[PDB]
């Protein structure tokens, strides 16, 4: 329960850090935000920059990269499966990553409701800002 759940959150944080470094490299080299091709999932857009591509989050859900306004966003989950978070998992993720990054909804233009330290997520797609311009 408690310790396993905290380590699943830490695993997403490690994936986030690795993907963020690779994304910044791609952005510096191409002058364009790396995005998953329309109609696909996964991080193969970053394959030149990563020895091993993260596939699924330990909290549930496949990874992909989307543009939301001017921001690069790590999407965690798809139609098939979203993330699951207890309040304690949400609290750790926010303590470690900080504010204005983790969202429970987006449109193509705008970040939606921010995750809070009291939020439970039951099989829903989650969003973490990687690059804020």
Author numbering: 8 to 140
Give sentences from the paper:
PilA1 is the major pilin of the type IV pili (TFP) system in this clinically important Gram-positive bacterium. TFP are the most widespread type of pili, and are uniquely found in both Gram-positive and Gram-negative species. PilA1 is thought to assemble into long pili filaments, which are decorated by the minor pilins.
